[PDB]
Amino acid sequence: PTINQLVRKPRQSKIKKSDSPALNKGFNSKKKKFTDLNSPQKRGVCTRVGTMTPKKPNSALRKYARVRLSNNIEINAYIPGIGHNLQEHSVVLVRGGRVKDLPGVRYHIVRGALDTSGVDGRRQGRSLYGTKKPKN
Amino acid sequence: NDRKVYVGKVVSDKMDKTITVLVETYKTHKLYGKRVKYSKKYKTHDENNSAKLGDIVKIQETRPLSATKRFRLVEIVEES
Amino acid sequence: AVKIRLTRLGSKRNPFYRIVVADARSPRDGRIIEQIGTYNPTSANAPEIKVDEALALKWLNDGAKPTDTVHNILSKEGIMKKF
Amino acid sequence: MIQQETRLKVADNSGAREVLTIKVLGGSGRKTANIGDVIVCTVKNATPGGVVKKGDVVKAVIVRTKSGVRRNDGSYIKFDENACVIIRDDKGPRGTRIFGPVARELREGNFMKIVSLAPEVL
Amino acid sequence: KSAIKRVKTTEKAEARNISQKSAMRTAVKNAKTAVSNNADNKNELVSLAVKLVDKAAQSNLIHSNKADRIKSQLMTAN
RNA sequence: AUGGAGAGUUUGAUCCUGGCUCAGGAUGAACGCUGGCGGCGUGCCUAAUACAUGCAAGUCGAGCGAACGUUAGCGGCGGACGGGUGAGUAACACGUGGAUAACCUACCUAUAAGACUGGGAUAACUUCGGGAAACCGUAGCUAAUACCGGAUAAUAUAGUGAAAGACACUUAUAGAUGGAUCCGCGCUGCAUUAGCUAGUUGGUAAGGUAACGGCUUACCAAGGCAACGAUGCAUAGCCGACCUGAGAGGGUGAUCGGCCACACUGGAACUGAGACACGGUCCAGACUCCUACGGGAGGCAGCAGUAGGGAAUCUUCCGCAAUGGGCGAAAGC
RNA sequence: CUAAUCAGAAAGCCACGGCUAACUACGUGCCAGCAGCCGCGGUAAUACGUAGGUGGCAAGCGUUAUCCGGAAUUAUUGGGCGU
């Protein structure tokens, strides 16, 4: 803890990397290179539906979504809830980041969000997987 | 508003008064606080005189009357 | 070339202004070096005319004359016509 | 006289710069062709941007060649290079701009849309 | 869009500067060129340009301190 | 110095830890929801996009050549315009003091030398004309406080221009304007870049910018460097703003910019009361294009709106009335 | 803009236990499935589908992500040496 060589030679900070690096980004075609944006809002347009089986910690069954973002790369999602949207090819409002217990996926759906409304079997949630005009 | 008594020492020289004087000062950095002493180089000139092998002098900030050189003052300590 | 200016931070509820010596080719808002104060031309806020224009009235023989319909404020005074 | 395997300088803004004639369509036995003829070539050198890319087979009408073109009054006219304009298989230019002058033989070849953008028409 | 008069006063400005600067181009082709060559050009052939460059430099564009450098290298050049 | 109590984290366990997810918000912060109304405010932050056009500092004279100051454009203006920003530079571009032994100037205000003598040309009326138009040819022009001899005008210690309505002209001179000739600290990172650029050291030029001077050139010797950042070198505005600390200030400086890089493009003969000029002036380029194909030269980094990219990303509602720039002895824009 | 003035409703709140502050359960028999770090349904989800609300609220519900004291995980104030 000696200060001579401290202006001769400095120190570092910690070492951390931020969250969702292949997110918060809008891929170019005119100038071909991405934008570092951290946008509030964004879209999702669909390529498949997707589902993998081996689930230990829950040990029930539920699928997810394989939705591609701009212009030739693998981007993957998951539908956290009791609502099955047996759909695809949508145009939505993204939710950024991952919910607990799925590795590598960081992209999601807001309730409603211009494509569908949601799993309409919900009426008590009034704020989960599709819930609009709910008597409070 | 007058002109200072900037001083220093000498290092080397070339043909027909490529003269100089050394510049230095007491001061420190804003970050990690040590009394490390520091310098930068200047540009004075003579006929051929204020030059290498001992020219502890003064210098000025005036009209240079010079190429890119800047000083007219020599106010000495001694010679070798 | 010299003209009058004013300051701006946040109030009104009565036509207010200020006294200063800015440039000619510019808007009502201008930079002020020797702040003399402000002016209240709302005929209601009398406690706001604390303008001590000491370097603004020295343009009489330097370069100044009532312009932009501002002679009304100088109409009450009379520190001119020295030539 | 534009025969097979000949490099020409396209005078358009489509996106090409040089093409190589592959065949002079017009009949069985045709060898050469003069101003006011259609030929099939391929892009050998293009520019970053446009609709035509390098390695594409398109049609074009040669305009202003090094060889002369005798008229009916007994007058001739020869340029200092061989150029051509890319068509769209409908007697129409694929681009919208044209550089350099053009001949007055395209008017008889039903090419009024190509003789309406050319700066000069000798 | 008021170029309807100053499309072209740049050009009377041109003419009324250039023809006189050229009539100086003949005023540096006599005296200053021949205050060396021994010619008669040090009397009234220096002094025409007194009132001639005076026809020039009563306006803001013609040389001002360069006027004091063109008159100190022709009249004081003895 | 109006001073620092966060959710849970160890193996199995008290214990010395270990930082994470995480908090609340604050963001030009809004998206589904929900859409009582508003005081006032900001929204091409999607793309400093290609264009439905024009759009913009503008008109006039008891001082001047058409008519009962109308009808000029001389002259003045403008032109570098308001506005648009943070596309482009490690740079005196930026906040402050500052040698001026690096600087001066009409616009703001008083003036002051006087107001003498001059010739006479150019816009319009176009005077006369070819031809898709309009582009161009003949070509006296008629004046102008003017295109304009000459006297001394001031720095020889010997430099010239003034053609005033009425009971408004040109100069010796000025206070001033953006600036700044420039000084200084303002003036970031890349050690996967030290044997140092031939001008590195600085003196010595006919030269010249309101401005000293390797600034091109003027003369000669480099080890000037030298293991200390020579130099290369990547974003390239700064600075009153905002969330904010207890305080050092610490960062982003967008509504808000007072200063500067920047108007299709490379320039540009030009010029200016202030230059290479966002609807100027020419000639090279590739653009939606207008043209008997005279060949036109235009692009809303200035309000709109069009195909749009669009988390949202706005009213072509009106037209000078809140300030007069400019024109004008003036009423007026 | 009192203005006589009728009654011209202030959408709807989240998880719904305990921390981030929340209340209990039929649906549920591991079939769907709860879940801001901690964390839940296999026959009493004091979590879930859904249903009358207490903690915050009425122009406001879950989310969007930027540096701030907090992060004492910069150490200018506030940095280990054998581990």
From TrEMBL, chain A:
Which UniProt key words apply to this protein? Ribonucleoprotein, Ribosomal protein, RNA-binding, rRNA-binding, tRNA-binding
Does the keyword rRNA-binding feature in the UniProt annotation? yes
CDD domains this protein is in?
Ribosomal_S12
Q: Name one GO cellular component term.
A: small ribosomal subunit
Outline the segment boundaries, as ranges, of region: Disordered.
1-54, 117-136
What this chain does, per the entry, is described as: With S4 and S5 plays an important role in translational accuracy. Interacts with and stabilizes bases of the 16S rRNA that are involved in tRNA selection in the A site and with the mRNA backbone. Located at the interface of the 30S and 50S subunits, it traverses the body of the 30S subunit contacting proteins on the other side and probably holding the rRNA structure together. The combined cluster of proteins S8, S12 and S17 appears to hold together the shoulder and platform of the 30S subunit.
| Quaternary structure, from the entry | Part of the 30S ribosomal subunit. Contacts proteins S8 and S17. May interact with IF1 in the 30S initiation complex.
Family stated for the protein in its record: Belongs to the universal ribosomal protein uS12 family.
Q: What is this protein called?
A: Small ribosomal subunit protein uS12
UniProtKB/TrEMBL annotation, chain B:
| Keywords, comma-separated and alphabetical | Ribonucleoprotein, Ribosomal protein, RNA-binding, rRNA-binding
The organism's superkingdom is given as Bacteria
The record describes its quaternary structure and partners as: Part of the 30S ribosomal subunit.
Identify the CDD domains for this entry: Ribosomal_uS17
Q: What does this protein do?
A: One of the primary rRNA binding proteins, it binds specifically to the 5'-end of 16S ribosomal RNA.
Which Gene3D superfamilies does this entry report, sorted A to Z? Nucleic acid-binding proteins (2.40.50.140)
Family, per entry: Belongs to the universal ribosomal protein uS17 family.
The entry lists its GO molecular-function terms as: rRNA binding; structural constituent of ribosome
Q: Which GO terms describe its cellular component?
A: cytosolic small ribosomal subunit
User: What is the protein name for this chain?
Assistant: Small ribosomal subunit protein uS17
- HAMAP family (UniProt xref): Ribosomal_uS17_B
User: Record's Pfam families?
Assistant: Ribosomal_S17
Cite a single GO BP annotation. translation
Q: Which residues cross the membrane?
A: none
From TrEMBL, chain D:
InterPro entries in the record: Ribosomal_uL14 (IPR000218), Ribosomal_uL14_bac-type (IPR005745), Ribosomal_uL14_CS (IPR019972), Ribosomal_uL14_sf (IPR036853)
Task: Drop me one GO molecular function for this one.
Answer: structural constituent of ribosome
The UniProt entry, under Pfam families, shows: Ribosomal_L14 (PF00238)
TM segments? none
Q: Does the keyword Nucleus apply?
A: no
Q: Which UniProt keywords apply?
A: Ribonucleoprotein, Ribosomal protein, RNA-binding, rRNA-binding
Q: What's one GO BP annotation on this UniProt entry?
A: translation
Q: Does the keyword GTP-binding apply?
A: no
A cellular component annotation (GO) from this entry: cytosolic large ribosomal subunit
The similarity annotation says: Belongs to the universal ribosomal protein uL14 family.
**What PANTHER family would the database entry show?**
50S/60S RIBOSOMAL PROTEIN L14/L23, LARGE RIBOSOMAL SUBUNIT PROTEIN UL14M
Binding partners and assembly: Part of the 50S ribosomal subunit. Forms a cluster with proteins L3 and L19. In the 70S ribosome, L14 and L19 interact and together make contacts with the 16S rRNA in bridges B5 and B8.
Instruction: Outline what the protein does.
Output: Binds to 23S rRNA. Forms part of two intersubunit bridges in the 70S ribosome.
Tell me which NCBIfam families the record gives.
rplN_bact
Q: What is this protein called?
A: Large ribosomal subunit protein uL14
Q: Say which species the protein is native to.
A: Staphylococcus schweitzeri
TrEMBL record, chain E:
Superkingdom classification of source: Bacteria
**What GO biological process, any one, is recorded here?**
translation
- The question of whether rRNA-binding is a record keyword is answered with yes
Q: Does the keyword rRNA-binding apply?
A: yes
UniProt entry keywords in alphabetical sequence: Ribonucleoprotein, Ribosomal protein, RNA-binding, rRNA-binding
Gene Ontology cellular-component annotations: cytosol; small ribosomal subunit
User: One MF term in GO for this entry?
Assistant: structural constituent of ribosome
Q: Which HAMAP family match?
A: Ribosomal_bS20
Q: Which NCBIfam families match?
A: S20
What role is this protein assigned? Binds directly to 16S ribosomal RNA.
The family assignment reads: Belongs to the bacterial ribosomal protein bS20 family.
Q: What is this protein called?
A: Small ribosomal subunit protein bS20
